[PDB]
Amino acid sequence: WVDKYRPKSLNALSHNEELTNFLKSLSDQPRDLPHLLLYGPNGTGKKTRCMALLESIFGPGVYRLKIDVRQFVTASNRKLELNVVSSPYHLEITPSDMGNNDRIVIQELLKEVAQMEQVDFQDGLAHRYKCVIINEANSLTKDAQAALRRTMEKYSKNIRLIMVCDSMSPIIAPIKSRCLLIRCPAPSDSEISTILSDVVTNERIQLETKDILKRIAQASNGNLRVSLLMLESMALNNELALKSSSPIIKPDWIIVIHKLTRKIVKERSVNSLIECRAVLYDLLAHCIPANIILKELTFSLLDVETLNTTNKSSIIEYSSVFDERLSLGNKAIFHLEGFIAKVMCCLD
Amino acid sequence: MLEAKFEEASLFKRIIDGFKDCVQLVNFQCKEDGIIAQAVDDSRVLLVSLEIGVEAEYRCDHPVTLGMDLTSLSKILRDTLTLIADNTPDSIILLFRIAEYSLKLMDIDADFLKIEELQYDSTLSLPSSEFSKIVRDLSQLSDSINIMITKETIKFVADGDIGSGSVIIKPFVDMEHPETSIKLEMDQPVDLTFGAKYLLDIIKGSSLSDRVGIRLSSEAPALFQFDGFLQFFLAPKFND
Amino acid sequence: MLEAKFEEASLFKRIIDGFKDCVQLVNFQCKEDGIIAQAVDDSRVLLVSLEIGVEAFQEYRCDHPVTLGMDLTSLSKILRCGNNTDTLTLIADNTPDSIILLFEDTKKDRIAEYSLKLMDIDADFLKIEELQYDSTLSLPSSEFSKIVRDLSQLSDSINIMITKETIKFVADGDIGSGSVIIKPFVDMEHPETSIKLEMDQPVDLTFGAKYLLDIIKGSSLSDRVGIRLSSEAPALFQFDLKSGFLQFFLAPKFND
Amino acid sequence: KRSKENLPWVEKYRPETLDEVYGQNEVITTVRKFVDEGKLPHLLFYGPPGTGKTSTIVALAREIYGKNYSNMVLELNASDDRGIDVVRNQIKDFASTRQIFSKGFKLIILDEADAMTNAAQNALRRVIERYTKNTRFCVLANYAHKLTPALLSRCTRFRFQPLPQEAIERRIANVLVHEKLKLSPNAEKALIELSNGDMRRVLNVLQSCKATLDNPDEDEISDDVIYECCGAPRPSDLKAVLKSILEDDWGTAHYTLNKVRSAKGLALIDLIEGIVKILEDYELQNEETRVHLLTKLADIEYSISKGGNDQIQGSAVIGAIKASFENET
Amino acid sequence: AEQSLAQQPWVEKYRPKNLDEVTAQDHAVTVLKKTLKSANLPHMLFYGPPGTGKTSTILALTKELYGPDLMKSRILELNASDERGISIVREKVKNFARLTVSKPSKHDLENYPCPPYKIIILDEADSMTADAQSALRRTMETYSGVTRFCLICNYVTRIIDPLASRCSKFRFKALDASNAIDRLRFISEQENVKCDDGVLERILDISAGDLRRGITLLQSASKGAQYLGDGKNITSTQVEELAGVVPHDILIEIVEKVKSGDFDEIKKYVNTFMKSGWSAASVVNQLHEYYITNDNFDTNFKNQISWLLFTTDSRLNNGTNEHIQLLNLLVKISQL
Numbered sequence A: 001w002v003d004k005y006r007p008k009s010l011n012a013l014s015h016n017e018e019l020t021n022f023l024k025s026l027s028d029q030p031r032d033l034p035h036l037l038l039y040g041p042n043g044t045g046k047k048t049r050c051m052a053l054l055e056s057i058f059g060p061g062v063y064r065l066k067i068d069v070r071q072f073v074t075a076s077n078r079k080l081e082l083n084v085v086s087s088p089y090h091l092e093i094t095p096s097d098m099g100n101n102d103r104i105v106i107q108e109l110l111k112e113v114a115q116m117e118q119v120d121f122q123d124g125l126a127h128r129y130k131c132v133i134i135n136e137a138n139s140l141t142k143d144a145q146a147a148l149r150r151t152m153e154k155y156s157k158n159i160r161l162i163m164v165c166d167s168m169s170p171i172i173a174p175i176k177s178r179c180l181l182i183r184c185p186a187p188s189d190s191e192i193s194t195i196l197s198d199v200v201t202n203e204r205i206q207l208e209t210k211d212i213l214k215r216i217a218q219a220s221n222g223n224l225r226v227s228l229l230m231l232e233s234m235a236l237n238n239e240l241a242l243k244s245s246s247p248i249i250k251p252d253w254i255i256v257i258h259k260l261t262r263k264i265v266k267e268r269s270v271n272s273l274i275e276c277r278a279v280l281y282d283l284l285a286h287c288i289p290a291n292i293i294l295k296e297l298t299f300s301l302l303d304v305e306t307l308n309t310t311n312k313s314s315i316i317e318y319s320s321v322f323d324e325r326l327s328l329g330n331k332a333i334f335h336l337e338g339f340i341a342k343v344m345c346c347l348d
Numbered sequence B: 001m002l003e004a005k006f007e008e009a010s011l012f013k014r015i016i017d018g019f020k021d022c023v024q025l026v027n028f029q030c031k032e033d034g035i036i037a038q039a040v041d042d043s044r045v046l047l048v049s050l051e052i053g054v055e056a057e058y059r060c061d062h063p064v065t066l067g068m069d070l071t072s073l074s075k076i077l078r079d080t081l082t083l084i085a086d087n088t089p090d091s092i093i094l095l096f097r098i099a100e101y102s103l104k105l106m107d108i109d110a111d112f113l114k115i116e117e118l119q120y121d122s123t124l125s126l127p128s129s130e131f132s133k134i135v136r137d138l139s140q141l142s143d144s145i146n147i148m149i150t151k152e153t154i155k156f157v158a159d160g161d162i163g164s165g166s167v168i169i170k171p172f173v174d175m176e177h178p179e180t181s182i183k184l185e186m187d188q189p190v191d192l193t194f195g196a197k198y199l200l201d202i203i204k205g206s207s208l209s210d211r212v213g214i215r216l217s218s219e220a221p222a223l224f225q226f227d228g229f230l231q232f233f234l235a236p237k238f239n240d
Numbered sequence C: 001m002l003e004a005k006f007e008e009a010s011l012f013k014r015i016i017d018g019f020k021d022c023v024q025l026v027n028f029q030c031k032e033d034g035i036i037a038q039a040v041d042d043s044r045v046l047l048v049s050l051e052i053g054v055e056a057f058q059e060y061r062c063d064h065p066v067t068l069g070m071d072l073t074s075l076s077k078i079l080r081c082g083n084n085t086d087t088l089t090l091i092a093d094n095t096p097d098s099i100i101l102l103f104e105d106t107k108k109d110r111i112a113e114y115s116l117k118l119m120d121i122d123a124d125f126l127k128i129e130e131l132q133y134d135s136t137l138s139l140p141s142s143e144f145s146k147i148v149r150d151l152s153q154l155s156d157s158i159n160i161m162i163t164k165e166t167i168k169f170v171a172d173g174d175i176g177s178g179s180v181i182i183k184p185f186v187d188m189e190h191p192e193t194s195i196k197l198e199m200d201q202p203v204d205l206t207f208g209a210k211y212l213l214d215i216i217k218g219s220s221l222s223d224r225v226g227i228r229l230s231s232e233a234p235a236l237f238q239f240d241l242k243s244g245f246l247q248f249f250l251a252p253k254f255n256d
Numbered sequence D: 001k002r003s004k005e006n007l008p009w010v011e012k013y014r015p016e017t018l019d020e021v022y023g024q025n026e027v028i029t030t031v032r033k034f035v036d037e038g039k040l041p042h043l044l045f046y047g048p049p050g051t052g053k054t055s056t057i058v059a060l061a062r063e064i065y066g067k068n069y070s071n072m073v074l075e076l077n078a079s080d081d082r083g084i085d086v087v088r089n090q091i092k093d094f095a096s097t098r099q100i101f102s103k104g105f106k107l108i109i110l111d112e113a114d115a116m117t118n119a120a121q122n123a124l125r126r127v128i129e130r131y132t133k134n135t136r137f138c139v140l141a142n143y144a145h146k147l148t149p150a151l152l153s154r155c156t157r158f159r160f161q162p163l164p165q166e167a168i169e170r171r172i173a174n175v176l177v178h179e180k181l182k183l184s185p186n187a188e189k190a191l192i193e194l195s196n197g198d199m200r201r202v203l204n205v206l207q208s209c210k211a212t213l214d215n216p217d218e219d220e221i222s223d224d225v226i227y228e229c230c231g232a233p234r235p236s237d238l239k240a241v242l243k244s245i246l247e248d249d250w251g252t253a254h255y256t257l258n259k260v261r262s263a264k265g266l267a268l269i270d271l272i273e274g275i276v277k278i279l280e281d282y283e284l285q286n287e288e289t290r291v292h293l294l295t296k297l298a299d300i301e302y303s304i305s306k307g308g309n310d311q312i313q314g315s316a317v318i319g320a321i322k323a324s325f326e327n328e329t
Numbered sequence E: 001a002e003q004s005l006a007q008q009p010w011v012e013k014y015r016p017k018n019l020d021e022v023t024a025q026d027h028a029v030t031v032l033k034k035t036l037k038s039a040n041l042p043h044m045l046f047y048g049p050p051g052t053g054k055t056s057t058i059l060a061l062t063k064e065l066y067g068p069d070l071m072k073s074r075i076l077e078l079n080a081s082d083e084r085g086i087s088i089v090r091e092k093v094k095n096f097a098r099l100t101v102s103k104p105s106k107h108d109l110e111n112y113p114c115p116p117y118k119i120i121i122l123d124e125a126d127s128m129t130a131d132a133q134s135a136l137r138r139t140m141e142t143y144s145g146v147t148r149f150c151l152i153c154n155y156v157t158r159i160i161d162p163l164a165s166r167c168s169k170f171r172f173k174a175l176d177a178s179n180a181i182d183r184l185r186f187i188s189e190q191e192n193v194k195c196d197d198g199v200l201e202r203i204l205d206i207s208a209g210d211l212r213r214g215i216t217l218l219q220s221a222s223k224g225a226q227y228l229g230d231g232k233n234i235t236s237t238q239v240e241e242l243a244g245v246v247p248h249d250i251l252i253e254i255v256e257k258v259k260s261g262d263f264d265e266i267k268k269y270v271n272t273f274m275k276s277g278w279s280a281a282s283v284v285n286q287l288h289e290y291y292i293t294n295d296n297f298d299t300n301f302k303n304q305i306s307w308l309l310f311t312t313d314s315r316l317n318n319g320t321n322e323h324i325q326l327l328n329l330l331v332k333i334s335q336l
């Protein structure tokens, strides 16, 4: 499972031995560690490896962290409330929670942390730099990244930025330049199969053979988090007894997207467009991002065998176009619906 | 089972009105000696340590932990007070005229840090009102107050944008008024810097005591001492 | 070098409170005679001119004529940070740099040394107070403030008319109109309440009330304000100090 | 220690009077006739950046009153606050009073009025004409679409034509007389072409070129010095790149572009501008060649304005030029 | 201060301290160095690619001009971290510009040439609003005798036309392996990095127009080599494995898949590729290099593939999905 079964060090990560060796090489000399930016697919263990690196450079007491609340004030009297995951050796921030106020929190909080120093009793003040983790750095606005551009170079002896992100493209070139770029490839089917096997031997799950683990690995597309979360759900659905004939439990939103793809392929009509608009509204209202919605819809429309090469080419072209549009817009549906319309124009 | 009594609510209201602004969740230890409160801020810059003597009725069978919010505490205290709690104190009762106020306890990851009396290169004491006025006057210029203790002279400077302030004071002792006295003991010329927003909040504790002690060391945090005892461990800026 | 040590502390405070919300940037020109300064309004309508000799200072030493410009808001910020029981000492180095204000208590050694970074103002010093005024007068400051802030409630303009041994303040507005007519008279048992007037030609000219309401704020310094009026000339509202004088040159409104 | 020589050449050679303002002869003559005859209407100077608007208005303010203009003239620039409350109080009070210093018509200089809110312009629309026999208004602008039509119609419109070549040669000659220096004719022509009407860039790059000679009293500023100081591509390398792209094949054209842009550290944004400026003179025997040649190159320029890549956009420019130059054959 | 610099990473450790340390732009450093003996310094506008020396050369110039004593009291520095707005530009920038220059001490007046003006450096001025830059116009023109303005940016287009006109422009050239290999050799010699014969060329080629990225890459490679303790040199593939460069064999497999294959095969291979963590920008750049450099294709294909790669890069530079864009680009290049 994702919880209670997780490597809390570098000698425990049982996949991507090359990345573990590189992280050990980086952790060899802690006081000379530059800023790091981890990129790769989702559910790859980037945060786990980052916490393992932190535990490797600092003491083993970095995992006992606590959530604190911070109040900030914008230009107006609008008060904003954020949370910080602080440990005796570092602090974690997810600036994505603010809509368009990432610059304020970034600048004020980072300057406040960089000016003062860390404390003792973990010999009165002497300690090394305090790490600041930035989770989901892609959602940072361009102005927030601009404000962050100078904070790294100005105060480097106190603040080291370890930023986790996926699909590194929405990161400005200066920020891409001023930190190391580390990649985390998804684990192969064999290593993730061993990860699932260790879980099912520790949790005492009743399986017939190892084929089900390989099926789970092939269905999770490489996301270790999804793999563990689906293995647990499948164990719960079959009463801790895994069989060779077990339905792969697809999350609800993927099932809705598949139904929408079937509806698109079958009926290419304006009323069908209104119904798909209703489904898209109902999906977006339950906090599902439009980018991943478009991605899954495109990769499901490309999977139906009823369309030939030309339809798939036009679909992927319209998908790239409308994804670029979505990356430059605020009203999400206004683009998604449009994309669907173009698909309806492509098939017939 | 803990049960303590104050003859007047003023002694407990002024202290909380003093230290309610910086910290919000503080852990209190109750034992035979007195109440020992400890808290660390969110950014780990200022550690607050409060010591309340039992002479200010007291009854505690064993030393216990507790945690209570100061916002609602000042809200209800806007007449003697009695604070009581039973075994496994999931609720603390405050009896005030007869009244009862039950407050719930919050779980705090309060790692008990030791309070040791190390050696300090400089230790001085100056009236609270004068220090609060100096801080409130220097904070208008800059946002970083530098304290420099050299050759039997104390110096509070602040280099701002519109100009620069520099208050130089010498130790003075008076007989006709014992409250206006400035004592100093120095072993090494020191010069540190601190944030003005922290001192702007600390100076509100001027109603707690008539004098304030400033203890400064080379690599150790600054100590702001109010005699109920209350000590602030403030962290400086490294250097530039 | 320039050292100006005052006799008291609140003297400079009261002197600066005259132009609290009247002007922003001033440039004190310090010479061997004393401190002379002038400042033009943000809308360039009224000009404040203050002169304080070596009479108000406890000690005065000016080697060469210096010119120190500064903003009035920062100056008031620095001046409010000093207790009214210490002494005020303006200290300037050889070359004009940030002016040093010094507060020294007379019983306990409390040295408050504030530094105010000077502003670089285009000090285009003119030559005023050298023009003949066709009408001059002098009246108590309390009566003038009363008249001004009583007529300011009925309109925004106030017409002053000096005729043959008569002064007239007229306020014409929307809700109504007011007119105060005073006559020159000199009392012997109370010489401070006397109203003096020397006129050569009849004068009639208007001013704004928003500026008179700020001019009358200088009545906290003296008790007898003088008013010099002339056609095609600014109006001189002068308050006499024990050492110098503070004078406002107000520009008259243009009538159609 | 502050002397007159402690100013950059942009501000060191600011015209003191109207006689030292070159180029805008048609406007300056009529302005001098205005001030001589005595009727100065509400003026609206509209011009590109660096043409002489502010210098002309300050010279006029000097010539009208005297050597002390800031005393009685009120100047509101973009640095000041120009809200509706400002127009209500400050400008309206300055417009409705007499002068403290002299006896004449007051002058309100509203510099960069295009940065004013519509509400402030609407409020000024009435005060500009209510007090006309006492004060005048000068409105300086670079964009004439920010000003409301009402405010724009109440002012005599004077457009500051970009500095023609003759005026810039005159000013360069004046500078080279006031500064010990020598300039080659071809280098002067290159500077003229690089100016693009801007009078400030001329003086800026002239000072920068005087700084890179190691002796400014004998050595003359050659065309190479001017082209190197700003990093602009010389016409020779530009023509070579264009010829290699048009005639040679893909590999050698890419190699030539890379070797030219890496010999002096050139930029694609300047190569594109030079290429379009030299290509707009060709006699294309159709209308569809120019369409693609402009569209693709403008798209590449817009993409470069975001700093995407540096090696993909060069091949993009090469392919765009080649595909455009295919309808001719 | 030497121990703090030694502890600092190589980026800050080897930051240029004088105008002779920046061995990148001999066209812009000489103009600033000759300003020392002179007194006329124009409003500077340093613009160029990320990581070329702007923020370092301005600090080096201010140091060499004023000295570490007067440096704190003679320059104001407004970076993107500070709150730069119309109100701030109107109040604080004008207040500091309309100020009297600080008095230089005898030490500074004797050692360093102290010019009679302060310096306001607005770093990363491409993040300012248009109204702020508009208000800056007369602020940077009236107080020109006591204050100068240095703007720094990556996009000269983002700065309004008046500010670009008034400021003296300085384009910072990109740093390739021809005019920047000396600095990297100096770093490798000062840090005992046992490099290969031509690995620094590959390092500077990977970081296209960037020296800070190359320095960080060299530091990380030296650390990874010293971790094992083997003592052998650092080869080129060892560097480009961690630099994000995709191995040449995988790129050849991609070219073989796109040269012949239907939509489904390319889609499956792109899914398998994106399973691993590869920056789409690097893959597009390597594809462009391999295709344009190659001579086995005709010009009619080269033009179309160049335009396609340009379009894909322009799409990727807007923060879009790397997987979808890469799949679309591969399908498009396959359609040819």
Ligand SMILES: Nc1ncnc2c1ncn2[C@@H]1O[C@H](COP(=O)(O)OP(=O)(O)OP(O)(O)=S)[C@@H](O)[C@H]1O
Binding pocket: D009, D010, D011, D013, D014, D015, D020, D021, D022, D023, D024, D048, D049, D050, D051, D052, D053, D054, D055, D056, D142, D163, D171, D199, D200, D203, E162, E165
């Ligand atoms: N016609 C001109 N004759 C001579 N020098 C000129 C002329 N126009 C500009 N200059 C020079 O360029 C400098 C700046 O010109 P300005 O008139 O201040 O620019 P501007 O007209 O205000 O345009 P803006 O306001 O920046 S859009 C002057 O100080 C002169 O050195």
Ligand SMILES: Nc1ncnc2c1ncn2[C@@H]1O[C@H](COP(=O)(O)OP(=O)(O)OP(O)(O)=S)[C@@H](O)[C@H]1O
Binding pocket: A153, A174, E010, E011, E012, E014, E015, E016, E021, E022, E023, E024, E025, E048, E049, E050, E051, E052, E053, E054, E055, E056, E057, E153, E154, E183, E211, E212, E215
């Ligand atoms: N010209 C140069 N000479 C020597 N080292 C350089 C040079 N340019 C960059 N570096 C190195 O790269 C580091 C960063 O340089 P910077 O000056 O911050 O780059 P940059 O131009 O500021 O990039 P930005 O700010 O993101 S546009 C320096 O500390 C040096 O280690």
Ligand SMILES: Nc1ncnc2c1ncn2[C@@H]1O[C@H](COP(=O)(O)OP(=O)(O)O)[C@@H](O)[C@H]1O
Binding pocket: A001, A002, A003, A005, A006, A007, A012, A013, A014, A015, A041, A042, A043, A044, A045, A046, A047, A048, A049, A164, A195, A224, A225
């Ligand atoms: N080496 C490993 N062994 C076992 N589990 C792992 C390993 N690496 C990652 N995981 C599991 O993956 C889960 C989610 O990883 P996460 O940090 O969310 O990845 P990402 O940072 O890419 O989102 C964790 O709960 C962890 O249990």
Ligand SMILES: [Mg+2]
Binding pocket: D053, D054, D111, D112, D140
């Ligand atoms: Mg102008």
Ligand SMILES: [Mg+2]
Binding pocket: E054, E055, E056
């Ligand atoms: Mg920088």
